[PDB]
Design an enzyme around this catalytic site. Structure first.
Site, mmCIF file in Angstrom:
data_model
loop_
_atom_site.group_PDB
_atom_site.id
_atom_site.type_symbol
_atom_site.label_atom_id
_atom_site.label_comp_id
_atom_site.label_asym_id
_atom_site.label_seq_id
_atom_site.Cartn_x
_atom_site.Cartn_y
_atom_site.Cartn_z
ATOM 1 N N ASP A 1 -0.803 -4.813 5.201
ATOM 2 C CA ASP A 1 -0.575 -4.909 6.634
ATOM 3 C C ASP A 1 -1.432 -6.004 7.271
ATOM 4 O O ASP A 1 -2.363 -6.545 6.672
ATOM 5 C CB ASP A 1 -0.850 -3.568 7.305
ATOM 6 C CG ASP A 1 0.104 -2.483 6.850
ATOM 7 O OD1 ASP A 1 1.265 -2.808 6.528
ATOM 8 O OD2 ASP A 1 -0.306 -1.303 6.817
ATOM 9 N N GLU B 1 0.814 -1.213 0.000
ATOM 10 C CA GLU B 1 0.000 0.000 0.000
ATOM 11 C C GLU B 1 0.852 1.269 0.000
ATOM 12 O O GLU B 1 0.703 2.124 -0.880
ATOM 13 C CB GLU B 1 -0.979 -0.027 1.178
ATOM 14 C CG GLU B 1 -0.370 -0.150 2.567
ATOM 15 C CD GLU B 1 0.028 -1.575 2.910
ATOM 16 O OE1 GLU B 1 0.829 -2.171 2.161
ATOM 17 O OE2 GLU B 1 -0.472 -2.101 3.924
ATOM 18 N N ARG C 1 -0.729 -1.445 15.203
ATOM 19 C CA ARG C 1 -2.110 -1.770 15.551
ATOM 20 C C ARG C 1 -2.139 -3.145 16.202
ATOM 21 O O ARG C 1 -2.156 -4.167 15.513
ATOM 22 C CB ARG C 1 -2.994 -1.719 14.314
ATOM 23 C CG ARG C 1 -3.062 -0.347 13.681
ATOM 24 C CD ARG C 1 -3.927 -0.358 12.443
ATOM 25 N NE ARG C 1 -4.074 0.974 11.874
ATOM 26 C CZ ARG C 1 -4.867 1.264 10.852
ATOM 27 N NH1 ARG C 1 -5.601 0.333 10.265
ATOM 28 N NH2 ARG C 1 -4.923 2.515 10.409
ATOM 29 N N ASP D 1 -3.724 -6.266 9.514
ATOM 30 C CA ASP D 1 -5.068 -6.170 10.057
ATOM 31 C C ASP D 1 -6.137 -6.289 8.974
ATOM 32 O O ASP D 1 -5.856 -6.431 7.782
ATOM 33 C CB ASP D 1 -5.228 -4.858 10.821
ATOM 34 C CG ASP D 1 -4.996 -3.645 9.945
ATOM 35 O OD1 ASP D 1 -4.129 -3.717 9.049
ATOM 36 O OD2 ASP D 1 -5.679 -2.620 10.151
ATOM 37 N N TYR E 1 4.409 -3.736 13.950
ATOM 38 C CA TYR E 1 3.139 -3.160 13.527
ATOM 39 C C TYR E 1 2.419 -2.501 14.695
ATOM 40 O O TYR E 1 2.332 -3.069 15.786
ATOM 41 C CB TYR E 1 2.262 -4.247 12.910
ATOM 42 C CG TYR E 1 1.081 -3.721 12.138
ATOM 43 C CD1 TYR E 1 1.239 -2.720 11.197
ATOM 44 C CD2 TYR E 1 -0.184 -4.240 12.335
ATOM 45 C CE1 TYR E 1 0.165 -2.233 10.494
ATOM 46 C CE2 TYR E 1 -1.264 -3.766 11.628
ATOM 47 C CZ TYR E 1 -1.085 -2.759 10.711
ATOM 48 O OH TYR E 1 -2.162 -2.290 9.997
#
Ligand SMILES: [Zn+2]
Ligand SMILES: [Zn+2]
Ligand SMILES: [Zn+2]
Lengths: 846, 38
Positions: free
Chosen positions: A92, A8, A302, A94, A300
């Site tokens: 990522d 992304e 989150r 999530d 990461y």
């Protein structure tokens, strides 16, 4: 072969390229390439489902769409995918990354044997190698959970917002978790304004030992009861009795104390730490954390898992053993337990390489270096030996009174060494080694006056902590909740503290009354848990979506009805005695999405007797004094007037330089109002601050039929300038010839010449819409020389072409505040310019 | 003319120099070229 990896961020592309190499081509798919519709580009239900894209009745058909400007990237990705043999989706960890990966897959096509889904928690050589070794399949369940969430939020937003426009005010918005966050803030505001501070006094005592050491104590009992004088006279009497009495240390207490390091950061803990230590709120914290992760320095960001890999534990234990040494190891790892529902498959937020010191982060901005230092310090601390303190407590007695000291002294520091405190606490001092049953000699004593604290206003981080406690939202959501509650105008953040707009109170009350199931914290938590069940594959997405939608539609169809039927109560008026400048009538106090304002009841009378006059308020800003510390909020509450009809505090607004207005907290449920010439804190209008060349007054930015424009604040001066394509302030006009002969190119409008501090430019007769601007050519001016006002005619005399024959353009030199003419070739300046020196055109190389 | 007897020198008090000046100059412009006017 050539294998294509789609990531992304572009920075994530660069970092992953560092470890992939020549065999792999990395292409950065900037953001969500495919999304539900946004712009306009039983027919009511048809138009509603077309606006939503989602059709809840026809089994949630979704009609995803690809946004203006994405198509270029989609084309490039498709070409590369045709070239490539295996396509790697390296979003990522999530649910958002899974949704992005699914969107990519579905656009490119060829699904079954051409997509590998790559999963790494850090962008590092070992992690990337392990991730690419055995890639995973695309986890459709997590995609479905993300789609379920998105569909819920769009259903609630689009179905509720017209209801709120009809009943309350146009330009409102609503959101499932957003409304519950606003409810939390409004409930705390109501608790605060309800609070009526009591008053209590305290006494402090100064003493010297026979050994000449010095001790300071605080006085807490009278007559074996708690010492808490209510007034000054009582306190002075107590001080007298104390001074007369004779003091002895009747109590000597001692005991060891240990402190453990904090757990390694989960996202909520990281936001709380960054707010408390560094002052970063949520948006800055998560932006810098995302940069640090994409660069590759941290895991990461989150996560709700405190777990650490054996690799991490061994690395940090090695670092501690080498640098600190055995005393700070300790014998075995410090375990920390996350919630049983946490993503225990995830790690905590930790460094990717413990030896990389924050100073070494050459490519990270200083704030990101500070955030990395915080992460590193916490990670190192969490595994170190607990600190060791020894503590002393003393009690001293005189007459009817007892007085106390507590102190701690620090003797092993291991985790505190890496992670020091911000400031010394009240107990971080040295009590002298008085004996058991020692004696004391006396020095003069000080009273203090205090008012009980109200419940503390939420900070961004403390609101995130509250949400994490209740279970509303999730690590990926928190930043979006904190942003959207502000962006939507229900809550404002000031002094790093949360304040609730009156419109937020109105909307909260209406939503609680009508949609009690949606607004209840337990049902929000249960919905989040059911989305987690979906991601587990314990539940079927469409099912729970249908159940939600059935309940919501029942509540909506009830709520739509008339207020006598029981629907949403209108934005009821409260009325005050003030003379409307247009018709003198009594005036009432009203709330709109714009703010809080003073209105004349003729607004509710048909055209014949209608009055549209309005008066526009400025709230008093609370200016919390950082030097008052914990007092700063209490004194703010003390500063407020109190409503006559009720205990609720009052909030303050300015109506004239001579007049000021007080309004009750429960407005419009409570109708108390007060008016006073006395004027507490005041504010004014703004926008690109410009100086009016006609009267020297301040000029502000305003929009409407003139769109982006600048108007002077002086009521005696109506001078107006305009915004152009590539300049600030706003050249006024002075020469606004509607040159009909010059056509626009991006639109069908015609150009008009305007003047201003920026210079002389051409703008569309519809800048509000066309907003198309370009600088005039000298030949263009010579074509319409006649229409130019008397001053600007000199520009027409300027040479039209350079010695190279290129065409010239009129420019404005801000450093000298003068117009010149410069030639450009191929869009770049030729370096030739002519200015007007003493009635003749001085041309030369720039 | 002034028939002075001697010359005296000292540091300049800011109020004194401000008393000398007939105005303050605040902008770097020197002379207009369109008309040779300050
Ligand atoms: Zn009126
Ligand atoms: Zn009241
Ligand atoms: Zn003006």
């Amino acid at each position: 072969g050539k294998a294509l990896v789609i990531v992304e961020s572009p920075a994530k592309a660069k970092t992953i390229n560092k470890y992939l190499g020549s065999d792999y081509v990395v292409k950065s798919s900037v953001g969500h390439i495919r999304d539900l519709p946004t712009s306009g580009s039983k027919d009511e239900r048809g138009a509603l489902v077309n606006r939503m894209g989602v059709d809840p009745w026809h089994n949630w058909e979704a009609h995803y769409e690809v946004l203006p400007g994405k198509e270029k990237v989609v084309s490039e990705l498709k070409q590369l995918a045709e070239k490539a043999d295996h396509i790697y989706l390296a979003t990522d960890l999530d649910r958002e990354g899974e949704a992005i990966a699914w969107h990519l897959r579905e656009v490119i096509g060829g699904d079954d044997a051409r997509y590998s889904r790559v999963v790494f928690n850090e962008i590092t050589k070992n992690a990337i190698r392990q991730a690419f070794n055995k890639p995973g399949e695309l986890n459709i369940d997590r995609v479905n959970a993300q789609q379920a969430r998105r569909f819920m939020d769009r259903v609630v937003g689009y179905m509720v917002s017209p209801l709120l426009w009809k009943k309350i005010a146009r330009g409102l918005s609503a959101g499932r978790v957003q409304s519950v966050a606003v409810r939390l803030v409004v409930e705390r505001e109501r608790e605060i304004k309800a609070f009526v501070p009591e008053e209590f006094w305290e006494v402090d005592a100064s003493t010297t030992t026979p050994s000449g050491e010095a001790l300071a104590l605080q006085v807490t009992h009278q007559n074996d009861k708690p010492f808490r004088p209510v007034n000054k006279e009582q306190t002075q009497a107590a001080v007298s009795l104390l001074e007369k009495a004779r003091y002895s240390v009747l109590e000597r207490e001692d005991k060891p104390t240990t402190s453990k390091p904090g757990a390694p950061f989960i996202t909520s803990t990281l936001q709380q730490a960054a707010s408390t230590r560094l002052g970063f709120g949520v948006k800055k914290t998560m932006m810098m954390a995302q940069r640090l992760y994409e660069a590759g320095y941290i895991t990461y960001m989150r996560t709700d898992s405190t777990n650490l890999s054996q690799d991490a534990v061994n690395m940090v234990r090695g670092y501690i053993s080498d640098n600190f040494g055995k005393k700070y190891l300790p014998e075995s790892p410090n375990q920390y337990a996350s919630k049983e529902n946490s993503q225990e498959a995830h790690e905590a937020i930790r460094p990717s390489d413990v030896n990389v010191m924050a100073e070494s982060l050459k490519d990270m901005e200083a704030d990101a270096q500070k955030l990395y230092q915080l992460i590193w310090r916490q990670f190192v601390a969490c595994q170190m030996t607990p600190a060791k303190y020894d503590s002393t407590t003393l009690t001293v007695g005189a007459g009817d009174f007892r007085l106390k000291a507590r102190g701690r002294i620090l003797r092993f520091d291991g985790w505190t060494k890496v992670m020091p405190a911000l400031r010394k606490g009240d107990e971080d001092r040295i009590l002298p080694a008085v004996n058991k049953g020692d004696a004391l000699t006396l020095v003069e004593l000080t009273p203090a006056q205090h008012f009980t604290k109200p419940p503390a206003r939420f900070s961004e981080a403390s609101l995130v902590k509250e949400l994490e406690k209740r279970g509303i939202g999730r690590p990926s959501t928190y930043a979006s909740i904190i942003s959207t509650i502000q962006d939507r105008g229900y809550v404002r953040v000031e002094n790093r503290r949360f304040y609730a707009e009156k419109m937020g109170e109105i909307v909260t009350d209406r939503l609680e009354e009508n949609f009690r199931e949606l607004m209840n914290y337990d049902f929000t938590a249960q919905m989040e848990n059911s989305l987690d069940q979906v991601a587990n594959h314990e539940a079927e997405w469409k099912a729970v979506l249908d159940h939600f939608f059935s309940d919501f539609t029942q509540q909506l169809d009830k709520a739509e009805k008339d207020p006598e039927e029981g629907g949403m109560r209108p934005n009821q008026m409260v009325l005050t005695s003030i003379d409307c400048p247009t018709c003198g009538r009594k005036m009432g106090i009203r709330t709109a999405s714009t703010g809080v304002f003073l209105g004349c009841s003729g607004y509710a009378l048909p055209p014949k007797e209608r009055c549209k006059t309005t008066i526009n308020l400025v709230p008093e800003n609370e200016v919390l004094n950082v030097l008052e510390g914990e007092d700063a909020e209490t004194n703010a509450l003390r500063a407020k007037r109190r409503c006559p009809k009720c205990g609720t505090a009052m909030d303050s607004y300015l109506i004239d330089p001579k007049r000021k207005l007080h309004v009750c907290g429960n407005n419009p449920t409570c109708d108390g109002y007060e008016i006073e010439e006395g004027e507490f804190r005041i504010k004014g209008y703004d926008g690109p601050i410009v100086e009016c060349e006609k009267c020297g007054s301040e000029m502000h930015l305003k929009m409407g039929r003139f769109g982006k424009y600048m108007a002077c604040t002086n009521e005696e001066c109506k001078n107006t300038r305009k915004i152009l394509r590539n300049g600030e302030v706003a050249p006024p006009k002075e020469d606004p010839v509607p040159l009909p002969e010059l056509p626009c190119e991006k639109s069908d409008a015609y150009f008009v010449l305007r003047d201003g501090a920026a210079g002389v430019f051409l703008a569309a007769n519809t800048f509000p819409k066309s907003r198309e601007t370009r600088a005039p050519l000298v030949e263009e001016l010579y074509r319409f020389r006649d229409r130019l006002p008397e001053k600007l005619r000199y520009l027409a005399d300027a040479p039209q072409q350079d010695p190279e024959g290129n065409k010239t353009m009129v420019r404005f030199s801000r450093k000298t505040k003068q117009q010149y003419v410069s030639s450009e070739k191929d869009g770049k300046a030729t370096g030739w310019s002519a200015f007007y020196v003493d009635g003749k055109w001085v041309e030369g190389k720039k | 003319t002034e028939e002075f007897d001697a010359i005296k020198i000292a540091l300049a008090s800011p109020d004194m120099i401000r008393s000398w000046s007939f105005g303050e100059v605040k902008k770097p412009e020197t002379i207009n070229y369109r008309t040779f006017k300050p």
